[PDB]
Amino acid sequence: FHKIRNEDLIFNESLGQGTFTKIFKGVRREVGDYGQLHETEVLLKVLDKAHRNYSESFFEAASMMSKLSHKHLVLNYGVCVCGDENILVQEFVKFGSLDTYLKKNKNCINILWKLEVAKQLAAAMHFLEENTLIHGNVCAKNILLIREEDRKTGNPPFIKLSDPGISITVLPKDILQERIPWVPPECIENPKNLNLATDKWSFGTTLWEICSGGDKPLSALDSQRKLQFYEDRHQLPAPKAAELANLINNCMDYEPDHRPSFRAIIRDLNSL
Ligand SMILES: Nc1nc(Nc2ccc(S(N)(=O)=O)cc2)nn1C(=O)Nc1ccccc1
């Protein structure tokens, strides 16, 4: 990763929290192309000081994805490790995370919008699968909306997939349980079962989010009941707008070897 000076970063408003992280809008002063000076809007992800021992995982997450370049993967500018903080410096996406966008705009989001966003997320995951790179935390909060749909110009929305954060292979067990049903059943059994097939299951959970206007699946269940949901081999309920429900259930297959490839997933989506 490129090293960025603390002196060149300005922290502005808080944009919320992630797992053991705090998120801020900021500005980076930099010399750009042709030697021209720029002040660039950035997203700053800050690892909690009391959790500095997760920094290896925090940064290995961002590093692995940033060794590949793709139009549907978020751009990382570098890191700032000046002094006591661990900071990931990332492109600032105008419209933020998909989960809060769906909640605030669920009135004005139709099947064609959901299908376009689903196709774009599948394209990103197909790219990862072809490169045998595991993401490990596919979810609507980790989808960023670069551009809104503009029917007046026939422009579709455009999304990017963010970095996965601290791996489920090092997180506390109670956090993994709270992440049911994004974390697949085999990873609750053994977090070291993390595999390419992990991302197929979470992709299904994420489609459910996209179809449910920002609702969180199984949010009414506490962690003990989320565990028993998997023990009883239940599936999620079909969303009210059910056009994608069969694809959701096909992806959320309790047998990891039976989950469809992303090529097959893209073929399905192209049939609707
Ligand atoms: N790269 C990036 N850009 C933005 N932009 C943004 C814009 C507007 C809003 S708001 N509150 O006005 O709706 C919030 C955020 N967010 N972001 C990001 O990575 N978020 C994130 C993802 C996963 C976990 C934690 C944080």
CA of 14 to the centre of ligand 1 (A): 10
- Residue 47: phi and psi, rounded to 5, are -70, 130
Same domain, 186 and 197: yes
Task: List the determination method.
Answer: X-ray
CA of 162 to the centre of ligand 1 (A): 9
Is residue 185 within 8 Å of 235, Cβ to Cβ? no
Query: In the chain, how many domains are there?
Result: 2
Same domain, 229 and 264: yes
- The two tokens of residue 107 are 């009135």
Check which CATH number belongs to the domain holding 52 and give it: 3.30.200.20
Quick check: bond before 172 cis, omega within 30? no
Burial 243-271 (b: 16+ CB within 10 A, else e): ebbebbebbbbeebeebbebeebbebbee
Is residue 206 within 8 Å of 162, Cβ to Cβ? no
Cβ neighbours for 270, distance < 8 A, ≥ 6 positions apart: 119
Burial 2-29 (b: 16+ CB within 10 A, else e): eebeeebbeeeeebeebbbbebbebbbe
Same domain, 104 and 122: yes
For residue 134 and ligand 1, the question of a CB distance below 6 A is answered with no
Same domain, 115 and 242: yes
* Resolution of the experimentally solved model in angstroms: 1.9
Same domain, 102 and 50: no
Which among 127, 230, 234, 120 has a CA at the least distance from the CA of 185? 230
12 CA to centre of own chain:
23
Same domain, 65 and 125: no
What range defines the domain where residue 165 resides?
93-272
Ligand 1, atom 6, lies closest to the CA of 96
Distance CA 157, CA 145 (A): 7
Distance CA 86, CA 79 (A): 8
Residue among 21, 23, 90 to mutate when testing ligand 1 (max atoms within 8 A of CB): 23
Same domain, 181 and 232: yes
Distance CA 248, CA 205 (A): 7
